[PDB]
Amino acid sequence: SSRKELANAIRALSMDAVQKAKSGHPGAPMGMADIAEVLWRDFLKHNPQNPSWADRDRFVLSNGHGSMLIYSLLHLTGYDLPMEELKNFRQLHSKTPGHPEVGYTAGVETTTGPLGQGIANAVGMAIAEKTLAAQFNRPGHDIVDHYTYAFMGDGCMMEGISHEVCSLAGTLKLGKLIAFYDDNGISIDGHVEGWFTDDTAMRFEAYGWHVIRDIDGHDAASIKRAVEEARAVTDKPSLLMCKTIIGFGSPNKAGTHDSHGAPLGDAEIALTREQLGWKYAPFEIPSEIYAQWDAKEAGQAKESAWNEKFAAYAKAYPQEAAEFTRRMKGEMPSDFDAKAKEFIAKLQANPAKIASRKASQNAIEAFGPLLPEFLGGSADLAPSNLTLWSGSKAINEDAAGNYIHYGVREFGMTAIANGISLHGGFLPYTSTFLMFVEYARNAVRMAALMKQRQVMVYTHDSIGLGEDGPTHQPVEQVASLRVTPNMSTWRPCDQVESAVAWKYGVERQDGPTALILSRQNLAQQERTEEQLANIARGGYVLKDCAGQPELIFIATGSEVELAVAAYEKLTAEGVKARVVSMPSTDAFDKQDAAYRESVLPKAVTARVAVEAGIADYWYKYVGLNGAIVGMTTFGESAPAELLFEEFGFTVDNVVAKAKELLHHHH
Amino acid sequence: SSRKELANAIRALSMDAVQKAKSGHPGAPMGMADIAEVLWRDFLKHNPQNPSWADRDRFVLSNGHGSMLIYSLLHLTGYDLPMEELKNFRQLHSKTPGHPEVGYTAGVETTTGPLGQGIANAVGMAIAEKTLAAQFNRPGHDIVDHYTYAFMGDGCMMEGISHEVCSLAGTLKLGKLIAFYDDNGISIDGHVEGWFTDDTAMRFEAYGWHVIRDIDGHDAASIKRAVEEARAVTDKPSLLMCKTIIGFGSPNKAGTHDSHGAPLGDAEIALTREQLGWKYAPFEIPSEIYAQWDAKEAGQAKESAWNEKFAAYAKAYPQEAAEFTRRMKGEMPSDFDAKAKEFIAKLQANPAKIASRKASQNAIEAFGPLLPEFLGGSADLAPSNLTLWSGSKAINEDAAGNYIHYGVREFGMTAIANGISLHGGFLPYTSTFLMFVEYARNAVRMAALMKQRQVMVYTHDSIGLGEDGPTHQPVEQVASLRVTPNMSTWRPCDQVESAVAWKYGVERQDGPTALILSRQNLAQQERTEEQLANIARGGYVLKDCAGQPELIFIATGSEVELAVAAYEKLTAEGVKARVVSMPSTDAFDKQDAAYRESVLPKAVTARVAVEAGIADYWYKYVGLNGAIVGMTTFGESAPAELLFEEFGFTVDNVVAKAKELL
Ligand SMILES: Cc1ncc(C[n+]2c([C@](O)(CO)[C@@H](O)[C@H](O)[C@H](O)COP(=O)(O)O)sc(CCOP(=O)(O)OP(=O)(O)O)c2C)c(N)n1
Ligand SMILES: Cc1ncc(C[n+]2c([C@](O)(CO)[C@@H](O)[C@H](O)[C@H](O)COP(=O)(O)O)sc(CCOP(=O)(O)OP(=O)(O)O)c2C)c(N)n1
Ligand SMILES: [Ca+2]
Ligand SMILES: [Ca+2]
């Protein structure tokens, strides 16, 4: 078959699958089919029979609406994605969801759909390869050596995140990153010139990318020459400007916004078959075409060669080889649990009244020698977030390092870290002030959706940060995280809860963990062995009374000290009170009914929440007959101690609100 | 006095105020003082005696951590910002908060601090000026003619939002936007080359900006020449690449990250006075320096001249002048309330089952002829969000238009719209799929913080959008808006609640309004006159029983129909059931306690919330002894009907959860 015929197999499967679903996006798959044919058939290093091969090239579809492009490719090349699944495009529990999802489709590297995040993930995967190669490769043993290829369109280019990640990719000289820009002149509103006029080549040259202009995206030879050129440039990421026609093949819809996001229609599909010379019926692919598309034999050969290379590496470098295998699997060191518990016990036994941002730094320092897989960073706030430890080495200085200066790029940082976690080999942590989680907010959600391990270090968590004022002082941000499916959020009240939360985060294999950390010093609380162990259960009894409490305080983070002070005052007056520390609502909610009842007994309705965060959240635990000492407004610019007074975070106010509650109950 | 001495007054005030507060950022104010002296003294058209003058130039400090820069400028040029306020920098309830805040302080145009948003706001202000000029200017009567100047640093340049708004600024040929880049090579982590290596000039030429390279940011002659060149280029926004030294004047901390964000210290301040040759004590400014800085006389002269121009315009164009005044004040047309009510009444009387995204478009169509101040748009989703009406005219085609194709730029769109609302003269609406509010999240918060009127049109609100799947299907986004201070959030259940929500949004004077709209068709509910009037109260009794209810459903948006069906089933069994429609929790919360008690009686604890969004929100209304039929997971890619079934949005499930309570 000709290259065009082979590319037309993608066009057929894509338009037919979309038609059967009566839903989806035929435009981009039809426009990019010739580019995909050259990349996948001539260049991509992969094994359909082992999508987890450590040294495979990584491909990312950043324009993820064109999901049938990737499903066509995976099916044709021989991945475990049968034709039946293509017939179930966009149907419940199929392996072919409307946008591609990592985890339950063989060969899909990341979940896209939110524009711009794919290219960010690709930058992360490229950083991962570069860093892993620098760490593990040895003279005569280049066990890490693979490319990262990304497809992206006008949507991804317009998004601010593309600026963040492509700027950084230039700084880091990611010579194995090669992106293809689907330059088709069309977006949903129509011809893009009304709203998008960048000289995109000049923009990417500004970033230090090697740009290849004016590629005929429908000519295999031209595409192939461009890929070879990009591969020859080893010191810059490459952007291939591929001029394509959206919906290529459709006489009436090619080059129109109409081909972007709806089925072509049966009449138009018939006309498209005729224009393309594609004779086969929907979901029909002949043996001869499978024979040319299939990658099983080449894939086997390439992975076998690599396995031999790795075996020779293991002989010459056994310790390094065992570390590489461990890290690629995402397994923890065998002695980590014991060593981390020893650290936590030491903290409980040796009180220190320090900011939880500092307690976080101390946990990084403690874990650093144990977790060589750390690849951490901050969005230009290293000295404020406290993300550096004694063994940190920035990758812009030494490629075998473990630290990334992300610059002022919260969204890019977080989506890059998603790429890092997806790649394998590393445990990323990222950091900024908690307020600026709002800049990165969808990338945080994407880590949760993709079940990725990433520790998110969010300092300066409340009005306790003081003078910087309401644009910086979080109020409603913690609540936003708490209600996010599969998110874990910890607001530790002292250095001990901080270390427990850090341990929880690094050991959490199936989703991310946000740490909510103070600028100001936090009092250490006394704990029995049982209480110390109970921190990990998310909510636990910290102070108690004999018999049923008349009053339960529920407090988090910096406000536990306040709640304990109120508890002491009320107790001295003969009130039967309890204090529950709730460092993690999500962990608490995951405990069984018996444990939750033991902490927050259903009989006790007089419950007082105390937290320098939005009050409305706390009805979840206090119900309609309790009280909440929280924030209901934005903050103010003033010294922290004056703000806490202003906003009612005082022993006198907490006591008064508790007594007022009890008077109402009585 | 010399220009350098005049600029040094900013340096002294800034380092001294930071020192007194033991908090704040002396670096950028010290680095930008010479640029500020040229801009403010030689070019800026403003009147300190009236910071609200319609035709003033707008200045924006996008690098807002350098707040003492703007406070020094406002004080020195004669605004109502006394020395005592500078001496109370960063102190509770002062007019000098750590980052500048609009409303707090005479002459502050916007609230900055979140990097990147200031330049976005400035792009919005320049869009507003260009559009207002095209709408209102007449031959011989150019009543709108002002510049938008912005200062910005490496942080703003690194942020993605700068790409979004500066790209669009280039497309829109905003020739009266002039930005000064504080090119000082330092950020918090240290020397920027480790993480920031863009050829920023080349980047901005790629956006179609006019770029002036290699300006000596410490040389008045160099700066003045560059501003003149930028003003002469009328068809492109301009970027001035100003090479400066952070903390200029400090022998030991100039050019270091140490000068960015902490007091210099008393010893270093003394050395800085010596290096600068500044001989005045903290908070001492001699009369000769005030004399050269003060702008009261020139400002009053310029504004008076404008007032005379406006009077002549008003003689020739009385209707247009009246509209200009109304729109600049943000006042509504006097008959808008009556006309909108008539529209709402018509919808109730003429039922239609349509998607609330379509009901939204219909409200835009009804209000369009009434609100010429609309400046609306969508982030490349016009045909899906349904933001165009018959009278929409895109400003890239017609400068006097009322519609912006924002492209795929949700964050930039929203912060640009903040600039539009801040400017005066317009009522912006913006739009995207609700999920992608997450891309714009901090700009949405900033609209609320700044008490700005903007209608945020968020369609495709739930699993009801179907096949696009979990990356697109909102679950927890509405809950996050609901708990945002000063945010109004409406999730209308039919075309009638949609129109009421739109009315509420445009009539807000002091904050933004998010509309939570469906992809799929919504049934219209029957309403009495009382119920119809009560939609605007955010929560109301839609279906009821005789006497005290034994069971209350609380439902929103697309789930009201489901709640009504459960209500009918239980009512037929003889349960005393009620349905409350809760289109806006914030509007409901603001009602008097007698009204709230009439809707959700305190004695009735058997409450069932029903909404295709995160369950945890609803404990606020159902407490510990109710039930919630909501989402607790991400969505799935499948047809909407099958998703509602899969996730428990069925009459059987709602009825079963209700029976569990009774
Ligand atoms: C961050 C972000 N923003 C907007 C979008 C939305 N978006 C997208 C979608 O949500 C798909 O992910 C929509 O196509 C959506 O499916 C339909 O509008 C649904 O229509 P309806 O039938 O419900 O009315 S794609 C996109 C603009 C397309 O620009 P491109 O130039 O990237 O697309 P091309 O490959 O040339 O067609 C845009 C703007 C996104 N996916 N991610
Ligand atoms: C969207 C966003 N991201 C990060 C920031 C943070 N930020 C800022 C601050 O939050 C101020 O708004 C911090 O300075 C903050 O006050 C301190 O870190 C507090 O220190 P601590 O005593 O609490 O430890 S500024 C900054 C980047 C600095 O780069 P520039 O090059 O813009 O600053 P320059 O004018 O040259 O000094 C950055 C990175 C922001 N304002 N907005
Ligand atoms: Ca396109
Ligand atoms: Ca700087």
**Per residue, what are the HEC states of A10-66?**
HHHHHHHHHHHHCCCCCHHHHHHHHHHHHHHHHHCCCCCCCCCCCCCCEEEECCHHH
Q: Among B164, B268, B410, B561, which one carries the catalytic annotation?
A: B410
State the distance from the centre of ligand 4 to the C-alpha of A384, rounded, in angstroms: 16
Residue with tokens 């700027």: A167
Q: State if residue A111 touches ligand 1 by the CB under 6 angstroms criterion.
A: no
Count the residues in chain B: 662
Q: Choosing among A85, A94, A123, A197, which should be mutated to test the B contact, i.e. which has the most B CBs within 10 A? A: A197
Q: What is the identity of the amino acid at A230?
A: A
Beta bridge pairs of residue B628 = B609
As a dihedral over the C-alpha atoms of residue B116, residue B118, residue B119, residue B124, rounded to 10 degrees, the angle is 130
- Shortest CB distance from B90 goes to which of A98, A206, A637? A637
How far away is chain B from the Cα of A165, in angstroms, using its nearest Cα? 9
How far away is chain B from the Cα of A324, in angstroms, using its nearest Cα? 28
B-chain residues within 8 Å CB-CB of A638? Answer: 90-93
Tokens of B263: 């007091």
Supply the residue whose CA is at minimum distance from atom 33 of ligand 1.
A187
Tokens of A393: 């080495």
Measured distance CA(A467)–CA(B99) in Å, rounded: 9
> B637: Cβ–Cβ under 8 A, 6 or more apart, which residues?
A90, A91, A92, A94, A97, A98, A99, A101, B467, B468, B469, B470
- The DSSP code for B330 is T
Beta bridge pairs of residue B152 = B181
**Percent composition of chain A: helix, strand, coil (DSSP 3-state, to 5):** 50, 15, 40
Q: Which of A605, A480, A616, A474 is nearest to B589 (CA)?
A: A616
Measured distance CA(B447)–CA(B540) in Å, rounded: 28
Measured distance CA(B527)–CA(B155) in Å, rounded: 53
> A274: Cβ–Cβ under 8 A, 6 or more apart, which residues?
none
Q: How many Cβ atoms sit within 10 Å of the Cβ of residue B482?
A: 24
How far away is chain B from the Cα of A347, in angstroms, using its nearest Cα? 30
Q: How far is CA B572 from CA B569, B656, B661, in A?
A: 5, 15, 18
B439 shares contact with chain A (CB less than 8 Å): yes
Q: Which of A604, A650, A655, A596 is nearest to A626 (CA)?
A: A604
b/e sequence A44-62, b meaning 16+ C-beta within 10 Å? bbbbbbebebbbbbbbbbb
A328 HSE (CA, 13 A, CB side): 17
Q: How far is CA A415 from CA A162, A394, A422, A439, A456, in A?
A: 11, 19, 11, 11, 12
How far away is chain A from the Cα of B203, in angstroms, using its nearest Cα? 5
Q: State if residue B153 touches ligand 2 by the CB under 6 angstroms criterion.
A: yes
Q: Measured in Å, how far apart are chain A's first and last C-alpha atoms? A: 86
Measured distance CA(A60)–CA(A70) in Å, rounded: 9
Q: Which of A428, A595, A445, A590 is nearest to A505 (CA)?
A: A428
CB-based burial of residue A214 (10 Å sphere; 0-12 exposed, 13-18 middle, 19+ buried)?
exposed
Cα A550 vs. chain centroid, distance in angstroms? 43
| Alpha helix segments (H runs only) across B333-461 | 336-349, 356-367, 410-423, 441-449
Contact check, Cβ <8 Å, A158/B408:
yes
Question: Would residue A188 be called left, alpha or beta, if left means φ above 0 and alpha means ψ between -120 and 50 degrees?
Answer: alpha
Atom of ligand 1 nearest to the CA of A188: 27
Beta bridge pairs of residue B509 = none
Q: How far is CA A409 from CA A177, A237, A406, A449, in A?
A: 20, 19, 6, 21
Q: How far is CA A332 from CA A420, A500, A507, A651, in A?
A: 17, 16, 7, 43
Residue with tokens 């194995």: A176
Has domain A1-325 been given CATH number 3.40.50.970?
yes
Whether residue A423 is annotated as binding a ligand: the answer is no
Measured distance CA(B174)–CA(B610) in Å, rounded: 48
Residue with tokens 């050969």: A301
- Answer positive or negative: Cα dihedral of B52, B53, B55, B58: negative
Contact check, Cβ <8 Å, B409/A449:
no
Contact check, Cβ <8 Å, B616/A483:
yes
> A593: Cβ–Cβ under 8 A, 6 or more apart, which residues?
none
3-state DSSP assignment of residue B62: coil
Backbone angles phi, psi at A659, to 5 degrees: -65, -40
**What is B205-232 written as a DSSP string?**
HHTT-EEEEEEETT-HHHHHHHHHHHHH
> B388: Cβ–Cβ under 8 A, 6 or more apart, which residues?
B361, B382, B403
3-state DSSP assignment of residue A354: strand
Q: Choosing among A62, A446, A624, which should be mutated to test the B contact, i.e. which has the most B CBs within 10 A? A: A624
Q: Choosing among A236, A467, A586, A622, which should be mutated to test the B contact, i.e. which has the most B CBs within 10 A? A: A467
Has domain B326-536 been given CATH number 3.40.50.970?
yes
Residue with tokens 């002062």: B94
Q: CA A313, A316, A318 angle in degrees (round to 5)?
A: 80
Contact check, Cβ <8 Å, A383/B188:
yes
Nearest CA in chain A to B388: A189
> A261: Cβ–Cβ under 8 A, 6 or more apart, which residues?
A24, A25, A27, A65, A188
Measured distance CA(A186)–CA(A25) in Å, rounded: 13
Beta bridge pairs of residue A516 = A458
For this PDB entry, the determination method is X-ray
Cα B409 vs. chain centroid, distance in angstroms? 14
Q: CA A49, A113, B124 angle in degrees (round to 5)?
A: 155
Residue pair B551/B575 in contact (Cβ under 8 Å)? The answer is: yes
Whether residue B75 is annotated as binding a ligand: the answer is no
Q: Measured in Å, how far apart are chain B's first and last C-alpha atoms? A: 83
Q: Which of B298, B300, B326, B321 is nearest to B311 (CA)?
A: B321
Pocket test for ligand 1, best of A151, A188, A195 (most atoms within 8 A of CB): A188
Q: Which of A412, A510, A518, A526 is nearest to A465 (CA)?
A: A518
Whether residue B25 is annotated as binding a ligand: the answer is yes
**What is B491-550 written as a DSSP string?**
--SSHHHHHHHHHHHHH-SSS-EEEE--SSEEPPPP--HHHHHHGGGS-EEEE--SSS-S
Q: State if residue B338 touches ligand 1 by the CB under 6 angstroms criterion.
A: no
3-state DSSP assignment of residue B433: strand
3-state DSSP assignment of residue A493: coil
Q: Which of B463, B528, B532, B529 is nearest to B494 (CA)?
A: B532
So what's the architecture of A537-666 in CATH?
A: 3-Layer(aba) Sandwich (3.40)
Residue pair A97/A67 in contact (Cβ under 8 Å)? The answer is: yes
| Alpha helix segments (H runs only) across A114-236 | 117-136, 154-158, 160-171, 200-206, 220-232
- The DSSP code for B167 is H
Q: What is the identity of the amino acid at A316?
A: A
**Percent composition of chain B: helix, strand, coil (DSSP 3-state, to 5):** 50, 15, 40
As a dihedral over the C-alpha atoms of residue B365, residue B371, residue B375, residue B376, rounded to 10 degrees, the angle is -30
| Alpha helix segments (H runs only) across B22-93 | 27-38, 67-77, 83-86
Work out the angle between the directed axes of helices B356-367 and B495-507 (0-180°, nearest 10).
50
- The DSSP code for A386 is I
B-chain residues within 8 Å CB-CB of A616? Answer: 482-483, 620
Q: What resolution, expressed in A, was reported for this entry? A: 1.6
State the distance from the centre of ligand 2 to the C-alpha of A528, rounded, in angstroms: 41
Backbone angles phi, psi at A547, to 5 degrees: 75, -175
Identical fold for domains A1-325 and A326-536, yes or no, is yes
Question: Would residue A407 be called left, alpha or beta, if left means φ above 0 and alpha means ψ between -120 and 50 degrees?
Answer: left
State the distance from the centre of ligand 4 to the C-alpha of B269, rounded, in angstroms: 21
- Answer positive or negative: Cα dihedral of A526, A528, A529, A535: negative
Q: Which of A217, A212, A210 is nearest to A183 (CA)?
A: A217
* Cβ-defined contacts of B301-309 (< 8 Å, 24+): B302/B45, B302/B46, B302/B47, B303/B47, B303/B49, B303/B50, B303/B53, B303/B55, B303/B56, B306/B53, B306/B54, B306/B55, B306/B143, B309/B141, B309/B142, B309/B143
Measured distance CA(A587)–CA(B304) in Å, rounded: 65
- Shortest CB distance from A439 goes to which of B442, B468, B602? B442
> B88: Cβ–Cβ under 8 A, 6 or more apart, which residues?
B94, B95, B96
Measured distance CA(A16)–CA(A25) in Å, rounded: 11
b/e sequence A559-569, b meaning 16+ C-beta within 10 Å? bbbbbbbbbeb
Q: State if residue B384 touches ligand 1 by the CB under 6 angstroms criterion.
A: yes
Cα A460 vs. chain centroid, distance in angstroms? 22
Q: What is the identity of the amino acid at B175?
A: G
Q: How far is CA A179 from CA A414, B285, B517, in A?
A: 20, 57, 36
Contact check, Cβ <8 Å, A195/B396:
yes
Backbone angles phi, psi at B382, to 5 degrees: -50, -50
Cα B472 vs. chain centroid, distance in angstroms? 23
Q: Which of B16, B14, B24 is nearest to B91 (CA)?
A: B24
Q: How far is CA A391 from CA A365, A372, A374, in A?
A: 8, 10, 11
Measured distance CA(A409)–CA(A407) in Å, rounded: 6
Domain range annotation of chain B: 1-325, 326-536, 537-662
Beta bridge pairs of residue A543 = A579
Residue pair B397/B131 in contact (Cβ under 8 Å)? The answer is: no
Residue pair A394/A388 in contact (Cβ under 8 Å)? The answer is: no
State the distance from the centre of ligand 2 to the C-alpha of B63, rounded, in angstroms: 9
Measured distance CA(A259)–CA(A261) in Å, rounded: 6
Nearest CA in chain A to B67: A468
- The DSSP code for A394 is B
A18 shares contact with chain B (CB less than 8 Å): no
Q: How far is CA A357 from CA A457, A497, B260, in A?
A: 8, 12, 21
How far away is chain B from the Cα of A373, in angstroms, using its nearest Cα? 22
Q: How far is CA B632 from CA A322, B377, B423, B660, in A?
A: 40, 33, 42, 19
- Shortest CB distance from A483 goes to which of B161, B412, B617? B617
State the distance from the centre of ligand 4 to the C-alpha of B62, rounded, in angstroms: 12
Work out whether strand A148-152 and strand A210-216 pair parallel, antiparallel, or are unpaired: unpaired
CB-based burial of residue B523 (10 Å sphere; 0-12 exposed, 13-18 middle, 19+ buried)?
middle
Measured distance CA(A204)–CA(A615) in Å, rounded: 46
Which chain A residues in 592-651 lie under 8 Å from chain B, judged by CB atoms?
A: 602, 605, 614, 616-617, 619-620, 623-625, 632-634, 636-639, 642-643, 646
CATH number for region B537-662: 3.40.50.920
Q: What is the identity of the amino acid at B68?
A: M
Q: How far is CA B251 from CA B22, B274, B578, in A?
A: 20, 9, 74
A318 shares contact with chain B (CB less than 8 Å): no
State the distance from the centre of ligand 2 to the C-alpha of B65, rounded, in angstroms: 7
Q: What is the identity of the amino acid at B615?
A: A
3-state DSSP assignment of residue A182: strand
Whether residue A384 is annotated as binding a ligand: the answer is yes
Residue pair B54/B303 in contact (Cβ under 8 Å)? The answer is: no
Beta bridge pairs of residue A148 = A58, A177
State the distance from the centre of ligand 4 to the C-alpha of A356, rounded, in angstroms: 28
Q: How many Cβ atoms sit within 10 Å of the Cβ of residue A612?
A: 29
B590 shares contact with chain A (CB less than 8 Å): no
Question: Would residue B514 be called left, alpha or beta, if left means φ above 0 and alpha means ψ between -120 and 50 degrees?
Answer: beta
Residue pair B35/B242 in contact (Cβ under 8 Å)? The answer is: yes
- Asked about B410 being catalytic, the answer comes back as yes
A256 shares contact with chain B (CB less than 8 Å): no
**What is A84-106 written as a DSSP string?**
HHHHTTTSTT-S--SS--TTSST
Measured distance CA(A222)–CA(A649) in Å, rounded: 67
Measured distance CA(A89)–CA(A86) in Å, rounded: 5
3-state DSSP assignment of residue A139: coil
Pocket test for ligand 1, best of B380, B432, B517 (most atoms within 8 A of CB): B380
Measured distance CA(A634)–CA(A435) in Å, rounded: 12
Measured distance CA(B615)–CA(B632) in Å, rounded: 6
